[PDB]
Amino acid sequence: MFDPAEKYKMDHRRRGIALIFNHERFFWHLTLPERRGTCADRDNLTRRFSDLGFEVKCFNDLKAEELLLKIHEVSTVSHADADCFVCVFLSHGEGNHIYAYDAKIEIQTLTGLFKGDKCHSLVGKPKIFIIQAARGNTNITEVDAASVYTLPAGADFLMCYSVAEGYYSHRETVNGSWYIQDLCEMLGKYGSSLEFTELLTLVNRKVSQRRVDFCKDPSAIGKKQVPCFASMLTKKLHFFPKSN
Amino acid sequence: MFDPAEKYKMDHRRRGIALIFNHERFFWHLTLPERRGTCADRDNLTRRFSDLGFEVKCFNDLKAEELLLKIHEVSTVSHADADCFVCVFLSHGEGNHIYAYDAKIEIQTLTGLFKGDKCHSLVGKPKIFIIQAARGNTNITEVDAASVYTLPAGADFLMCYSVAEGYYSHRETVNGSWYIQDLCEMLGKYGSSLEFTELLTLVNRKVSQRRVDFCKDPSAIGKKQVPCFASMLTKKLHFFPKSN
Numbered sequence: 372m373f374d375p376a377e378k379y380k381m382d383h384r385r386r387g388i389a390l391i392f393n394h395e396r397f398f399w400h401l402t403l404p405e406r407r408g409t410c411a412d413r414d415n416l417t418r419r420f421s422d423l424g425f426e427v428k429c430f431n432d433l434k435a436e437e438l439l440l441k442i443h444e445v446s447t448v449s450h451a452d453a454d455c456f457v458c459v460f461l462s463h464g465e466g467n468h469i470y471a472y473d474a475k476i477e478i479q480t481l482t483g484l485f486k487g488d489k490c491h492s493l494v495g496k497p498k499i500f501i502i503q504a505a506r507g508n509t510n511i512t513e514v515d516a517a518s519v520y521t522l523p524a525g526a527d528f529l530m531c532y533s534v535a536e537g538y539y540s541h542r543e544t545v546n547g548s549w550y551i552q553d554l555c556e557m558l559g560k561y562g563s564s565l566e567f568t569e570l571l572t573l574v575n576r577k578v579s580q581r582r583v584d585f586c587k588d589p590s591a592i593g594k595k596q597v598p599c600f601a602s603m604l605t606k607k608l609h610f611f612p613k614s615n
Numbered sequence: 616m617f618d619p620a621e622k623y624k625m626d627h628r629r630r631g632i633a634l635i636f637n638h639e640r641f642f643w644h645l646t647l648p649e650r651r652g653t654c655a656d657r658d659n660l661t662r663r664f665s666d667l668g669f670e671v672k673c674f675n676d677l678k679a680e681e682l683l684l685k686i687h688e689v690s691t692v693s694h695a696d697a698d699c700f701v702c703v704f705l706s707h708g709e710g711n712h713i714y715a716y717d718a719k720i721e722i723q724t725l726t727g728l729f730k731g732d733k734c735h736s737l738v739g740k741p742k743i744f745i746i747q748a749a750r751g752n753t754n755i756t757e758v759d760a761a762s763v764y765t766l767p768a769g770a771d772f773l774m775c776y777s778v779a780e781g782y783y784s785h786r787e788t789v790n791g792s793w794y795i796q797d798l799c800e801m802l803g804k805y806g807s808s809l810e811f812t813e814l815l816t817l818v819n820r821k822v823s824q825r826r827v828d829f830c831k832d833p834s835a836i837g838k839k840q841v842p843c844f845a846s847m848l849t850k851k852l853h854f855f856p857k858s859n
């Protein structure tokens with residue numbers, strides 16, 4: 372009965388929710404820099420995910436408690452009538468942690484709320500996390516060292532990462548993160564036609580190909596960016612237009 | 616002219632080398648169990664990779680020095696005339712380490728030898744690592760806890776993992792590892808037709824779907840296996856049959 376071309380069923384009434392936690396500033400006593408440009412990331416993502424049928428819900432500079440409450444809320448609501456779930460972190464991170472405004476949170480505990488154990492309505496449905504996080508140091512290009520582990524999650528999770536270990540994350544202070552720029556461009560051109568990992572692969576090409584030989588800053592030279600993704604998907608994932 | 620359907624060029628004279636480091640026993644003073652069944656993994660892989668045009672080269676129970684010498688050898692030979700490179704570890708691991716016979720080796724240092732910097736002949740060519748490693752506990756099913764970090768590598772690397780964090784790796788003592796059985800079956804049916812990550816996705820479905828409710832051992836119940844992969848590929852990867 373088994374089928375090599377099998378797709379996730381993307382014919383539910385609604386596409387689903389895209390959460391976007393967007394962190395620009397941080398509590399003084401953490402000594403983390405402003406992520407100038409993250410608002411371009413937030414806006415570009417919000418548009419592209421809207422266009423694919425997502426109920427996008429942004430949240431600027433939440434503290435740990437607020438963030439946990441919001442994501443727990445979304446986990447316990449029924450996704451019975453939904454194709455999939457997307458969650459995006461634009462912040463600083465270290466190891467297995469993302470930074471809220473006031474403290475770091477274990478990525479494991481955020482992804483764990485959708486494990487299908489904990490959230491029955493999303494069993495057998497794609498759960499995509501996109502993470503644009505790294506180490507805190509007119510349109511300048513600021514450069515952070517990779518810091519967030521390229522963790523997997525569980526069955527039917529796709530974890531997507533701005534940068535792999537050893538490489539470097541770039542953010543233009545007006546245009547935003549290189550990862551998110553190229554992601555959003557490819558979503559723009561291909562989101563509705565291409566399989567999502569085929570697209571994520573295009574993003575890897577586009578970001579790896581960005582030249583870093585002749586740079587305005589002398590010490591940003593030879594700092595290449597290579598993003599990855601960790602698939603535990605079990606079927607092809609397409610965001611074909613849902614019919615009106 | 617940027618192209619969403621673009622493929623790695625797989626028209627070089629030879630397909631390339633598949634290394635297989637296969638560890639069954641270990642130095643007494645490490646206190647690691649025999650991996651009974653790993654020979655089925657080694658043989659099944661050897662066949663399937665042969666059939667796709669690979670010069671397969673197996674190495675049973677090498678010590679650290681021997682293993683490093685062998686893999687460094689293969690890194691410094693010219694791959695100019697080759698499509699790609701495959702390297703497979705069947706052993707125990709912990710964190711960012713694989714076990715040789717006598718001691719553990721940093722996966723980073725093994726994958727590092729093929730980073731475009733260090734190995735010019737493989738720049739722009741797929742470098743696939745397949746890792747069937749976990750924590751040391753007629754045809755019995757032995758069950759190990761996930762232990763090896765699902766690390767990325769660099770540009771044009773595909774890292775493939777038996778099991779993700781939190782889940783469990785299964786090995787039948789005659790048929791071999793669940794990961795490798797389902798990988799080899801899918802290679803058998805689809806290797807030559809399907810795109811390789813499409814296939815790795817089928818392997819994720821097949822392994823996640825293995826029932827663990829009614830088990831011979833009482834304490835092996837509810838121990839699910841979900842394998843992942845970390846793509847930093849930049850093009851589609853096909854193993855179409857080569858002529859002559």
Ligand SMILES: Oc1cc(F)ccc1CNc1ncccc1-c1ccncn1
Pocket residue numbers: 520521522523760761762763764765766767779780781
């Ligand atoms: O993925 C697994 C699998 C396990 F069995 C156990 C733990 C992890 C955590 N993942 C990581 N993934 C990718 C890069 C690094 C880590 C990392 C690195 C340093 N410390 C902790 N983690």
